[PDB]
Protein backbone atom coordinates (compact mmCIF):
# COMPACT_ATOMS: atom_id res chain seq x y z
CA UNK A 1 0.00 0.00 0.00
CA UNK A 2 1.23 3.49 -0.86
CA UNK A 3 -0.90 6.64 -1.01
CA UNK A 4 -0.75 10.26 0.13
CA UNK A 5 -3.55 10.95 2.59
CA UNK A 6 -5.80 13.98 2.12
CA UNK A 7 -4.40 15.88 5.08
CA UNK A 8 -3.91 18.72 2.63
CA UNK A 9 -7.60 18.64 1.74
CA UNK A 10 -8.77 19.02 5.35
CA UNK A 11 -6.04 21.46 6.38
CA UNK A 12 -6.06 23.54 3.16
CA UNK A 13 -9.85 23.85 2.93
CA UNK A 14 -11.15 27.31 2.08
CA UNK A 15 -14.25 27.16 4.32
CA UNK A 16 -14.61 25.37 7.65
CA UNK A 17 -17.97 24.51 9.16
CA UNK A 18 -19.31 26.28 12.23
CA UNK A 19 -18.58 24.88 15.68
CA UNK A 20 -22.17 23.70 16.17
CA UNK A 21 -21.88 21.99 12.77
CA UNK A 22 -18.30 20.78 13.23
CA UNK A 23 -17.44 18.97 10.01
CA UNK A 24 -16.31 15.35 10.30
CA UNK A 25 -14.24 13.34 7.82
CA UNK A 26 -13.14 9.70 7.83
CA UNK A 27 -9.71 8.73 6.48
CA UNK A 28 -8.59 5.13 6.00
CA UNK A 29 -6.59 2.95 3.60
CA UNK A 30 -3.65 5.31 3.18
CA UNK A 31 -0.07 5.96 4.26
CA UNK A 32 -0.11 9.10 6.39
CA UNK A 33 2.89 11.35 7.09
CA UNK A 34 2.57 13.35 10.31
CA UNK A 35 6.17 14.61 10.14
CA UNK A 36 5.20 17.52 7.90
CA UNK A 37 2.34 18.41 10.23
CA UNK A 38 4.49 18.17 13.35
CA UNK A 39 7.47 20.14 12.02
CA UNK A 40 5.42 23.08 10.74
CA UNK A 41 5.88 26.17 12.91
CA UNK A 42 2.63 27.85 11.82
CA UNK A 43 0.49 25.91 14.31
CA UNK A 44 -0.03 27.86 17.51
CA UNK A 45 -1.21 24.76 19.39
CA UNK A 46 -0.29 21.12 18.78
CA UNK A 47 -1.15 19.50 22.11
CA UNK A 48 -1.69 15.74 21.83
CA UNK A 49 -3.27 13.21 24.18
CA UNK A 50 -2.42 9.54 24.62
CA UNK A 51 0.19 9.62 21.82
CA UNK A 52 3.38 11.65 22.01
CA UNK A 53 3.71 13.96 18.96
CA UNK A 54 7.16 12.61 18.09
CA UNK A 55 6.48 8.95 17.27
CA UNK A 56 3.23 9.22 15.28
CA UNK A 57 5.05 7.92 12.20
CA UNK A 58 5.79 4.67 14.06
CA UNK A 59 2.13 3.76 14.72
CA UNK A 60 -0.37 1.91 12.52
CA UNK A 61 -3.91 3.23 12.94
CA UNK A 62 -7.09 1.23 12.43
CA UNK A 63 -8.90 4.30 11.06
CA UNK A 64 -8.56 8.03 11.61
CA UNK A 65 -11.14 10.80 11.89
CA UNK A 66 -10.67 14.54 11.34
CA UNK A 67 -13.03 17.02 13.00
CA UNK A 68 -12.70 20.58 11.72
CA UNK A 69 -14.39 23.81 12.78
CA UNK A 70 -13.69 27.35 13.99
CA UNK A 71 -13.45 28.90 17.45
CA UNK A 72 -13.38 32.42 18.88
CA UNK A 73 -9.67 32.48 19.56
CA UNK A 74 -8.88 32.86 23.25
CA UNK A 75 -11.01 29.93 24.45
CA UNK A 76 -9.15 27.44 22.26
CA UNK A 77 -7.82 25.49 25.25
CA UNK A 78 -11.48 24.92 26.13
CA UNK A 79 -11.40 22.09 23.57
CA UNK A 80 -9.82 19.31 25.64
CA UNK A 81 -10.85 16.28 27.72
CA UNK A 82 -12.42 17.18 31.05
CA UNK A 83 -12.23 20.91 30.37
CA UNK A 84 -15.69 22.49 30.60
CA UNK A 85 -17.28 25.68 29.34
CA UNK A 86 -19.91 27.03 26.99
CA UNK A 87 -19.00 25.48 23.64
CA UNK A 88 -17.63 22.32 25.25
CA UNK A 89 -20.90 21.73 27.09
CA UNK A 90 -23.21 22.79 24.25
CA UNK A 91 -21.36 22.41 20.93
CA UNK A 92 -18.41 19.98 20.91
CA UNK A 93 -17.30 17.73 23.78
CA UNK A 94 -14.47 15.21 23.78
CA UNK A 95 -14.55 12.03 25.89
CA UNK A 96 -12.55 12.09 29.10
CA UNK A 97 -10.36 9.19 27.91
CA UNK A 98 -9.88 10.74 24.48
CA UNK A 99 -6.95 9.63 22.33
CA UNK A 100 -5.70 11.82 19.51
CA UNK A 101 -4.25 15.24 18.78
CA UNK A 102 -5.69 18.76 18.88
CA UNK A 103 -4.55 21.37 16.36
CA UNK A 104 -5.17 25.11 16.29
CA UNK A 105 -3.75 28.02 14.29
CA UNK A 106 -4.73 31.67 14.03
CA UNK A 107 -6.78 32.17 10.87
CA UNK A 108 -7.60 35.87 11.02
CA UNK A 109 -6.54 36.19 7.37
CA UNK A 110 -8.94 33.36 6.44
CA UNK A 111 -12.12 33.91 8.48
CA UNK A 112 -12.61 37.46 9.76
CA UNK A 113 -14.50 39.96 7.61
CA UNK A 114 -13.94 43.71 7.50
CA UNK A 115 -17.50 44.69 8.37
CA UNK A 116 -18.22 41.56 10.39
CA UNK A 117 -18.24 37.81 9.84
CA UNK A 118 -21.83 37.09 10.93
CA UNK A 119 -21.59 33.64 9.33
CA UNK A 120 -20.19 31.35 12.06
CA UNK A 121 -22.77 30.19 14.60
CA UNK A 122 -22.45 28.60 18.03
CA UNK A 123 -25.34 27.35 20.14
CA UNK A 124 -26.37 28.96 23.42
CA UNK A 125 -28.88 27.86 26.05
CA UNK A 126 -29.20 24.17 25.27
CA UNK A 127 -31.74 22.24 27.31
CA UNK A 128 -29.21 19.71 28.65
CA UNK A 129 -25.50 18.99 28.39
CA UNK A 130 -23.94 17.40 25.30
CA UNK A 131 -22.51 13.89 25.29
CA UNK A 132 -19.05 13.40 23.76
CA UNK A 133 -18.86 13.16 19.96
CA UNK A 134 -22.46 13.93 19.02
CA UNK A 135 -23.87 16.32 16.44
CA UNK A 136 -26.58 18.85 17.28
CA UNK A 137 -28.19 20.85 14.45
CA UNK A 138 -31.75 21.34 15.71
CA UNK A 139 -32.86 24.98 15.42
CA UNK A 140 -35.85 24.94 17.78
CA UNK A 141 -36.59 28.03 19.84
CA UNK A 142 -35.38 27.65 23.43
CA UNK A 143 -37.92 28.31 26.19
CA UNK A 144 -36.21 29.68 29.31
CA UNK A 145 -39.02 28.49 31.54
CA UNK A 146 -42.31 30.28 32.13
CA UNK A 147 -44.82 30.17 29.27
CA UNK A 148 -43.85 28.17 26.16
CA UNK A 149 -43.35 29.48 22.64
CA UNK A 150 -44.65 28.28 19.27
CA UNK A 151 -42.21 29.47 16.62
CA UNK A 152 -42.06 32.83 18.41
CA UNK A 153 -39.26 34.84 20.01
CA UNK A 154 -39.44 37.07 23.06
CA UNK A 155 -38.90 37.19 26.80
CA UNK A 156 -37.22 34.02 28.11
CA UNK A 157 -37.59 32.73 24.53
CA UNK A 158 -34.18 33.42 23.01
CA UNK A 159 -32.84 32.03 19.76
CA UNK A 160 -30.46 29.09 20.37
CA UNK A 161 -27.73 30.02 17.85
CA UNK A 162 -25.57 33.14 18.17
CA UNK A 163 -23.18 34.49 15.54
CA UNK A 164 -19.62 35.68 16.03
CA UNK A 165 -18.29 39.17 15.40
CA UNK A 166 -14.95 38.31 13.82
CA UNK A 167 -13.19 41.39 12.43
CA UNK A 168 -9.57 42.10 11.47
CA UNK A 169 -9.35 44.61 14.35
CA UNK A 170 -10.41 42.40 17.25
CA UNK A 171 -7.26 41.51 19.19
CA UNK A 172 -5.73 38.03 19.38
CA UNK A 173 -8.30 37.11 22.02
CA UNK A 174 -11.26 37.75 19.70
CA UNK A 175 -9.71 36.50 16.44
CA UNK A 176 -10.86 33.41 14.51
CA UNK A 177 -9.05 30.13 15.04
CA UNK A 178 -9.34 26.87 13.09
CA UNK A 179 -9.21 23.56 14.96
CA UNK A 180 -8.92 20.27 13.07
CA UNK A 181 -8.74 17.98 16.11
CA UNK A 182 -8.03 14.41 14.99
CA UNK A 183 -9.09 11.09 16.50
CA UNK A 184 -7.44 7.66 16.39
CA UNK A 185 -9.43 4.47 16.95
CA UNK A 186 -6.53 2.31 18.19
CA UNK A 187 -9.00 -0.58 18.11
CA UNK A 188 -6.31 -3.21 17.36
CA UNK A 189 -8.31 -4.10 14.24
CA UNK A 190 -6.73 -4.66 10.82
CA UNK A 191 -4.76 -1.46 10.35
CA UNK A 192 -5.72 0.83 7.47
CA UNK A 193 -3.59 3.94 8.11
CA UNK A 194 0.08 3.75 9.07
CA UNK A 195 3.16 5.93 8.82
CA UNK A 196 5.90 5.71 6.21
CA UNK A 197 8.25 2.74 6.56
CA UNK A 198 9.71 -0.15 4.58
Amino acid at each position, epitope marked *: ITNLCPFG*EV*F*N*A*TRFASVYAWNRKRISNCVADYSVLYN*SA*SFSTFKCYGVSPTKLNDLCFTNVYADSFVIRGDEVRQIAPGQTGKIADYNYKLPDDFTGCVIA*W*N*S*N*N*L*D*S*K*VGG*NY*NYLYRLFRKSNLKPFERDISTEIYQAGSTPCNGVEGFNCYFPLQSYGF*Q*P*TNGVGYQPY*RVVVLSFELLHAPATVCGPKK
Partner: antibody, heavy 120, light 109 residues
Framework: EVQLVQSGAEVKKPGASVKVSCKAS????????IIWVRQATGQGLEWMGW????????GYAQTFQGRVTMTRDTSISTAYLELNSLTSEDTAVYYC?????????????WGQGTLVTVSS | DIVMTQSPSSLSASVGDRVTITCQAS??????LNWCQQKPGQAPKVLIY???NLETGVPSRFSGSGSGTDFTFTISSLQPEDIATYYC???????????FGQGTKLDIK
Protein backbone atom coordinates in the same frame (compact mmCIF):
# COMPACT_ATOMS: atom_id res chain seq x y z
CA GLU B 1 4.59 24.51 -10.46
CA VAL B 2 1.13 26.08 -10.45
CA GLN B 3 0.15 27.20 -13.95
CA LEU B 4 -2.81 29.36 -14.98
CA VAL B 5 -2.57 28.92 -18.75
CA GLN B 6 -5.22 31.08 -20.40
CA SER B 7 -6.72 31.49 -23.85
CA GLY B 8 -5.14 33.78 -26.42
CA ALA B 9 -6.16 37.27 -27.46
CA GLU B 10 -9.52 37.70 -29.18
CA VAL B 11 -11.29 40.38 -31.21
CA LYS B 12 -15.07 40.73 -31.24
CA LYS B 13 -17.59 43.21 -32.58
CA PRO B 14 -19.57 45.48 -30.23
CA GLY B 15 -22.58 43.85 -28.61
CA ALA B 16 -21.29 40.30 -29.14
CA SER B 17 -20.43 37.71 -26.48
CA VAL B 18 -16.95 36.51 -25.50
CA LYS B 19 -16.20 33.23 -23.71
CA VAL B 20 -12.73 33.37 -22.15
CA SER B 21 -11.23 30.15 -20.78
CA CYS B 22 -8.76 29.66 -17.94
CA LYS B 23 -6.76 26.43 -17.66
CA ALA B 24 -5.32 25.53 -14.26
CA SER B 25 -2.97 22.73 -13.25
CA UNK B 26 -0.70 21.65 -10.42
CA UNK B 27 -3.43 21.79 -7.76
CA UNK B 28 -6.93 20.54 -7.03
CA UNK B 29 -9.03 22.66 -9.39
CA UNK B 30 -12.41 21.94 -7.80
CA UNK B 31 -11.31 22.97 -4.30
CA UNK B 32 -10.48 26.71 -4.31
CA UNK B 33 -12.30 29.81 -5.49
CA ILE B 34 -11.40 31.49 -8.78
CA ILE B 35 -11.77 35.22 -9.45
CA TRP B 36 -11.33 37.52 -12.44
CA VAL B 37 -9.90 41.03 -12.72
CA ARG B 38 -9.85 43.31 -15.77
CA GLN B 39 -7.23 46.00 -16.35
CA ALA B 40 -8.33 48.60 -18.89
CA THR B 41 -5.77 50.44 -21.00
CA GLY B 42 -4.71 53.36 -18.83
CA GLN B 43 -6.65 52.27 -15.72
CA GLY B 44 -5.94 50.21 -12.64
CA LEU B 45 -7.05 46.70 -11.83
CA GLU B 46 -10.77 46.13 -11.36
CA TRP B 47 -12.17 42.98 -9.77
CA MET B 48 -14.75 41.02 -11.77
CA GLY B 49 -16.26 38.28 -9.63
CA TRP B 50 -15.85 34.93 -7.95
CA UNK B 51 -16.90 31.39 -8.81
CA UNK B 52 -16.63 28.31 -6.61
CA UNK B 53 -15.52 25.44 -8.90
CA UNK B 54 -17.19 22.77 -6.72
CA UNK B 55 -20.61 24.11 -5.72
CA UNK B 56 -20.92 26.43 -8.72
CA UNK B 57 -22.04 29.41 -6.63
CA UNK B 58 -21.08 32.73 -8.20
CA GLY B 59 -20.90 36.40 -7.30
CA TYR B 60 -20.40 39.57 -9.32
CA ALA B 61 -19.75 43.26 -8.80
CA GLN B 62 -22.83 45.47 -8.83
CA THR B 63 -21.35 47.75 -11.51
CA PHE B 64 -22.07 45.19 -14.26
CA GLN B 65 -24.35 42.69 -12.53
CA GLY B 66 -26.28 40.53 -14.99
CA ARG B 67 -23.89 41.05 -17.93
CA VAL B 68 -21.68 38.01 -17.21
CA THR B 69 -21.88 34.29 -16.47
CA MET B 70 -18.85 32.29 -15.28
CA THR B 71 -19.41 28.58 -15.86
CA ARG B 72 -16.97 25.72 -15.23
CA ASP B 73 -15.91 22.28 -16.44
CA THR B 74 -14.45 20.16 -13.64
CA SER B 75 -13.75 17.27 -16.03
CA ILE B 76 -11.08 19.29 -17.87
CA SER B 77 -10.36 21.60 -14.89
CA THR B 78 -10.94 24.88 -16.72
CA ALA B 79 -12.87 27.95 -15.61
CA TYR B 80 -14.92 30.03 -18.04
CA LEU B 81 -16.04 33.66 -18.07
CA GLU B 82 -18.82 34.73 -20.45
CA LEU B 83 -19.23 38.46 -21.09
CA ASN B 84 -22.19 39.49 -23.25
CA SER B 85 -23.00 42.82 -24.89
CA LEU B 86 -19.42 43.95 -25.40
CA THR B 87 -18.67 47.65 -25.86
CA SER B 88 -15.71 49.85 -26.75
CA GLU B 89 -14.79 50.54 -23.12
CA ASP B 90 -14.76 46.78 -22.47
CA THR B 91 -11.37 46.49 -24.22
CA ALA B 92 -9.25 45.28 -21.30
CA VAL B 93 -6.92 42.48 -20.25
CA TYR B 94 -8.64 39.86 -18.09
CA TYR B 95 -6.57 37.96 -15.51
CA CYS B 96 -8.09 34.73 -14.27
CA UNK B 97 -6.57 34.09 -10.85
CA UNK B 98 -7.12 31.26 -8.39
CA UNK B 99 -7.45 31.95 -4.67
CA UNK B 100 -5.33 29.23 -3.09
CA UNK B 101 -5.37 28.65 0.66
CA UNK B 102 -1.98 27.85 2.10
CA UNK B 103 -2.14 27.37 5.86
CA UNK B 104 -3.45 30.69 7.23
CA UNK B 105 -2.38 32.41 4.00
CA UNK B 106 -3.79 33.33 0.59
CA UNK B 107 -1.57 32.37 -2.35
CA UNK B 108 -2.51 34.01 -5.65
CA UNK B 109 -1.07 32.56 -8.88
CA TRP B 110 -2.19 34.72 -11.80
CA GLY B 111 -2.47 33.89 -15.48
CA GLN B 112 -0.74 35.63 -18.36
CA GLY B 113 -4.04 37.34 -19.22
CA THR B 114 -6.03 37.80 -22.40
CA LEU B 115 -6.37 41.01 -24.41
CA VAL B 116 -9.92 41.34 -25.78
CA THR B 117 -10.47 43.96 -28.48
CA VAL B 118 -13.95 45.40 -29.08
CA SER B 119 -14.12 47.30 -32.37
CA SER B 120 -15.71 47.32 -35.82
CA ASP C 1 -17.08 50.98 0.75
CA ILE C 2 -13.33 50.60 1.27
CA VAL C 3 -11.27 53.04 -0.81
CA MET C 4 -7.48 52.91 -0.91
CA THR C 5 -5.16 55.78 -1.85
CA GLN C 6 -1.63 54.93 -2.98
CA SER C 7 0.92 57.73 -3.27
CA PRO C 8 3.00 59.04 -4.85
CA SER C 9 1.46 58.48 -8.28
CA SER C 10 4.91 58.33 -9.89
CA LEU C 11 8.53 58.84 -8.89
CA SER C 12 12.09 58.28 -10.06
CA ALA C 13 15.22 57.24 -8.19
CA SER C 14 18.74 56.15 -9.09
CA VAL C 15 19.69 52.50 -8.74
CA GLY C 16 20.59 51.42 -5.22
CA ASP C 17 18.57 54.11 -3.42
CA ARG C 18 15.88 53.45 -0.83
CA VAL C 19 12.33 53.99 -2.13
CA THR C 20 9.12 54.28 -0.10
CA ILE C 21 5.48 54.23 -1.21
CA THR C 22 2.62 55.02 1.17
CA CYS C 23 -0.88 53.55 0.96
CA GLN C 24 -3.74 54.95 3.06
CA ALA C 25 -6.96 53.06 3.77
CA SER C 26 -10.21 55.01 3.90
CA UNK C 27 -11.54 52.58 6.52
CA UNK C 28 -9.66 50.40 8.98
CA UNK C 29 -8.83 47.01 7.46
CA UNK C 30 -6.52 45.62 10.14
CA UNK C 31 -3.78 43.95 8.11
CA UNK C 32 -5.72 42.62 5.09
CA LEU C 33 -3.32 44.22 2.62
CA ASN C 34 -0.94 42.89 -0.01
CA TRP C 35 1.59 44.50 -2.34
CA CYS C 36 1.71 43.41 -5.98
CA GLN C 37 4.08 44.25 -8.83
CA GLN C 38 3.44 44.51 -12.58
CA LYS C 39 6.37 44.38 -14.96
CA PRO C 40 5.51 45.65 -18.47
CA GLY C 41 3.38 43.00 -20.17
CA GLN C 42 3.73 40.32 -17.51
CA ALA C 43 0.86 39.40 -15.21
CA PRO C 44 0.71 40.72 -11.63
CA LYS C 45 2.90 38.91 -9.11
CA VAL C 46 2.04 39.35 -5.44
CA LEU C 47 5.21 40.49 -3.68
CA ILE C 48 4.11 41.00 -0.06
CA TYR C 49 1.25 39.33 1.82
CA UNK C 50 -0.13 40.46 5.16
CA UNK C 51 1.56 43.86 4.76
CA UNK C 52 4.55 42.54 6.72
CA ASN C 53 5.56 39.16 5.30
CA LEU C 54 7.49 38.71 2.06
CA GLU C 55 6.23 36.28 -0.55
CA THR C 56 8.27 33.10 -0.96
CA GLY C 57 11.19 33.44 -3.35
CA VAL C 58 11.26 37.25 -3.39
CA PRO C 59 14.60 38.97 -2.71
CA SER C 60 15.00 40.32 0.81
CA ARG C 61 15.30 43.89 -0.51
CA PHE C 62 11.54 44.47 -0.44
CA SER C 63 9.78 45.14 2.85
CA GLY C 64 6.36 46.14 4.11
CA SER C 65 5.26 47.88 7.31
CA GLY C 66 2.32 49.75 8.80
CA SER C 67 -1.11 48.67 9.96
CA GLY C 68 -4.64 49.81 10.71
CA THR C 69 -5.07 52.57 8.13
CA ASP C 70 -1.65 53.40 6.64
CA PHE C 71 0.93 51.05 5.14
CA THR C 72 4.40 51.53 3.70
CA PHE C 73 6.17 49.57 0.95
CA THR C 74 9.95 49.99 0.98
CA ILE C 75 12.71 48.94 -1.41
CA SER C 76 16.00 49.05 0.48
CA SER C 77 18.14 49.11 -2.68
CA LEU C 78 16.80 49.70 -6.18
CA GLN C 79 17.93 47.41 -8.99
CA PRO C 80 17.30 47.40 -12.75
CA GLU C 81 14.72 44.60 -12.60
CA ASP C 82 12.65 46.70 -10.18
CA ILE C 83 11.19 48.70 -13.09
CA ALA C 84 7.47 47.98 -12.76
CA THR C 85 4.18 49.29 -11.43
CA TYR C 86 3.27 48.64 -7.80
CA TYR C 87 -0.27 48.18 -6.48
CA CYS C 88 -1.94 47.97 -3.11
CA UNK C 89 -4.43 45.11 -2.80
CA UNK C 90 -6.99 44.92 -0.02
CA UNK C 91 -8.97 41.69 0.21
CA UNK C 92 -12.10 40.52 1.99
CA UNK C 93 -12.67 36.88 2.85
CA UNK C 94 -16.15 35.49 2.30
CA UNK C 95 -16.98 37.62 -0.73
CA UNK C 96 -13.47 37.55 -2.19
CA UNK C 97 -13.56 41.26 -2.96
CA UNK C 98 -10.31 42.77 -4.25
CA UNK C 99 -9.66 46.51 -4.15
CA PHE C 100 -6.60 48.07 -5.78
CA GLY C 101 -4.93 51.45 -5.60
CA GLN C 102 -4.04 53.80 -8.42
CA GLY C 103 -0.59 52.20 -8.79
CA THR C 104 2.87 53.72 -8.97
CA LYS C 105 5.66 53.39 -11.54
CA LEU C 106 9.39 53.26 -10.76
CA ASP C 107 11.76 54.82 -13.29
CA ILE C 108 15.51 55.04 -12.76
CA LYS C 109 16.94 58.43 -13.69
Amino acid sequence: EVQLVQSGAEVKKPGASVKVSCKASGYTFTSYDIIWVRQATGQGLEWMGWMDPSRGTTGYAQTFQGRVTMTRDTSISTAYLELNSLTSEDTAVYYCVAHIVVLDRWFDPWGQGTLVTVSS
Amino acid sequence: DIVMTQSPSSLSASVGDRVTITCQASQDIGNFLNWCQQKPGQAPKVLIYGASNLETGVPSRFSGSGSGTDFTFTISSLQPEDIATYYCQHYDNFPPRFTFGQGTKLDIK
